[PDB]
Paper text:
The causative agent, severe acute respiratory syndrome coronavirus 2 (SARS-CoV-2), uses its Spike protein (S) to recognize receptors on host cells, an initial step for viral infection. Key to this virus–host interaction is the binding between the S receptor-binding domain (RBD) and the host receptor angiotensin-converting enzyme 2 (ACE2). Therefore, the RBD has been a primary target for neutralizing antibodies that prevent ACE2 binding by either direct competition or steric hindrance. Here we report the rapid selection of synthetic antibodies (sybodies)24 in vitro using RBD as the bait.
Crystals of SR4- and MR17-RBD diffracted to 2.15 and 2.77 Å resolution, respectively, and allowed structure determination. MR17 also binds to the RBD at the “seat” and “backrest” regions but approaches the RBD at an almost perfect opposite direction of SR4, indicating divergent binding mode for these sybodies. The binding of MR17 to the RBD occurred on an 853.9 Å2 surface area with noticeable electrostatic complementarity. Interestingly, this surface was largely shared with the SR4 binding surface. The interactions between MR17 and the RBD were mainly mediated by H-bonding. Apart from the three CDRs, two framework residues, Lys65 and Tyr60, interacted with the same RBD residue Glu484, via a salt bridge with its side chain and an H-bond with its main chain. In addition, owing to their minute sizes, SR4 and MR17 could be docked into the “close”-S with minor clashes against the Asn343-linked glycans from the anticlockwise neighboring RBD. Such clashes may be partly responsible for the modest neutralization activity of MR17 as its neutralizing activity increased by 17-fold upon elimination of the glycosylation by alanine mutation. As previously reported for other RBD-targeting antibodies, SR4 and MR17 showed tighter binding with the trimeric S than with the monomeric RBD, likely reflecting the different oligomerization states between S and RBD.
Numbering used by the authors:
A (entry chain A): 1 to 110, 113 to 122
B (entry chain B): 333 to 527
């Protein structure tokens, strides 16, 4: 019943724009911190952005501050990641996660969405 | 002559989150610890350094009642010499603890359809809590060495975490109201006794 579905992504030219959505089922997205991660090829997962519970703040990696914006839609139970001024090193697979700390019967680690940024 | 007001503690309308655990001092009154110990309401009634049987033969300077809500999984932590998020960051007893831990399942009050997330525990602290310390900070916690002050990175965490109390959850995942009675024997006279 509890599930996280990524959507959006694809191919964009450097300087381009993109919006990824994370649709949660089984819980309200405001109660815990929600996160976006990305894994470039032959690199380790990186934390991109996070939005804390209940409007307790947002968090942005240095790599993407000012270009990326994370937000919560409590009606659609969805977390969005607006991607602007896309550089090519932003090419990775993008993953969302709930920092639930075991507070739900999750099947914790699980598909992702690929974003590709060209050189020009 | 005066009966100690244990109803105000055990029968309170609202209960604190464990991170902000409530404390009530009781003195200048008389307590029959077996009306409680022999009530069938309580699912856990364990003592330490003293024994549940002889509780009325004892006499203390003051008694402290600390109350809060945690998961059933975590009643093990309300005990001397325990570790884990609750004992470490929320409610710590000393290793020479004298007193009693009393707990009962409260799913019928503390969960809702869709889930109750009003209860919080502290997930992050720089150090473990000293016995009976109580931290209600909401300072951003810095994990790792990338600083968080000012512009805040990914490794920067709001310290408090919601419990997800679903009616249908396993009994370990369900809320428990917990009362800890601490027995303070000083060098001054006694004020809390048995019949
Ligand atoms: C916790 O509350 C129980 C009842 O809840 C309400 O509070 C009472 C003051 C009263 O208004 C009652 O009608 C409410 O429903 C208490 O149990 C009650 O105790 C009174 C004592 O005179 C008795 O007349 C009631 O019949 C009895 N009802 C029930 C359903 O138990 C608790 O009291 C203690 O626990 C009981 C199990 C029993 O051992 C009683 O004698 C104890 O005093 C309240 N807990 C406390 C005060 O610690």
């Amino acid at each position: 019943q509890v599930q996280l579905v990524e959507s959006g992504g694809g191919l964009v030219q450097a300087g381009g724009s993109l919006r990824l959505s994370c649709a949660a089922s089984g819980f309200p997205v405001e109660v815990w911190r929600m996160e976006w991660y990305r894994q470039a090829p032959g690199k380790e997962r990186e934390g991109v952005a996070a939005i804390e519970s209940y409007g307790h703040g947002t968090r942005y990696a240095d790599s993407v501050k000012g270009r990326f914006t994370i937000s919560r839609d409590n009606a659609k139970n969805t977390v969005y990641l607006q991607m602007n001024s896309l550089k090519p090193e932003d090419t990775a697979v993008y993953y969302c996660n709930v920092k639930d700390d075991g507070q739900l019967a999750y099947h914790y680690d699980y598909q992702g969405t690929q974003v590709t940024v060209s050189a020009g | 002559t005066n009966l100690c007001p244990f109803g105000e503690v055990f029968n309170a309308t609202r209960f604190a989150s464990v991170y902000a655990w409530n404390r009530k001092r009781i003195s200048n009154c008389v307590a029959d610890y077996s009306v409680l110990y022999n009530s069938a309401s309580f699912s856990t009634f364990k003592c330490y350094g003293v024994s549940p049987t002889k509780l009325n033969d004892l006499c203390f300077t003051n008694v402290y009642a600390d109350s809060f809500v945690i998961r059933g999984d975590e009643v093990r932590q309300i005990a001397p010499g325990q570790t884990g998020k609750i004992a470490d960051y929320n409610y710590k007893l000393p290793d020479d603890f004298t007193g009693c831990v009393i707990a009962w399942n409260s799913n019928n009050l503390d969960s809702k359809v869709g889930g109750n997330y009003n209860y919080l525990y502290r997930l992050f602290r720089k150090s473990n809590l000293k016995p009976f310390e109580r931290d209600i900070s909401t300072e951003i916690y810095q994990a790792g060495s990338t600083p968080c002050n000012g512009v805040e990175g990914f490794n920067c965490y709001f310290p408090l975490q919601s419990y997800g109390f679903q009616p249908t959850n396993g009994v370990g995942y369900q809320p428990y109201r917990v009362v800890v009675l601490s027995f303070e024997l000083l060098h001054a006279p006694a004020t809390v006794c048995g019949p």
